[PDB]
Amino acid sequence: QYNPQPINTSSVALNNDLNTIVQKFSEHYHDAWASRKIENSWVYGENWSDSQKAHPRLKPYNMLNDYEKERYKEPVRESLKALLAIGWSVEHSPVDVVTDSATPFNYNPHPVDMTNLTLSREMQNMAERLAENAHDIWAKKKKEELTVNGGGIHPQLVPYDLLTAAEKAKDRERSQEFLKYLQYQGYKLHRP
Ligand SMILES: [Cl-]
Ligand SMILES: [Cl-]
């Protein structure tokens, strides 16, 4: 069938340096996410609405609650722990009016643009492994949720390789951008 089994991260604990890079990427990625949502005509609203394209997380990072910040930090932290777990080493060595009208918070996100940075084929492969792991983490949690509530189904409870590209996009994009951001910030990833 499908038995999601995330990477075993036993013993792996992030030190202050790697917690800091998780924090800095999370803030960067929030601004990249907000920039994309605003480009796609989303606006801030107190309650999330898919139909009305209103999103409560469309605020400056420092106005987010801890739940909101963890939407970024949790999967990023887990992807970094998974990389370490499988033996990789991590060496730290004008304002447009319609853009501004998307929120009442004078928020014009301008994250660093890493579209001109490239990833080796090896790092592209690693981003796919980390995205698959994010999917397995989600799937294991979802199966637990369904089972304790007496059963049920979910259309994305299939192996990562059976998801469509569109289904894979959120996790793939996060890991690709994280690996670019590590590169940008002067980290070197070394294979086992
Ligand atoms: Cl430390
Ligand atoms: Cl923070």
Residue numbers in the entry: 2838 to 2930, 2952 to 3050
Sentences from the paper on this structure:
Insect RyRs have drawn a lot of attention since the market introduction of diamide insecticides used to control a broad range of destructive agricultural pests. Here we present the atomic-resolution crystal structures of wild-type and phospho-mimetic RyR Repeat34 from DBM (P. xylostella), a destructive pest devouring cruciferous crops globally.
The first group contains seven sites clustered in the phosphorylation loop, including one in helix α0′ (S2959), four in the flexible region (S2930, S2936, S2946, S2948), and two in the structured loop region (T2973, T2976). By docking the domain into the cryo-EM model of full-length RyR2, we found that Repeat34 is located at the top turret region of RyR cytoplasmic region, and Ser2946 and most other phosphorylation sites are in a region protruding away from the main body of the channel, which is structurally less conserved in Repeat34.
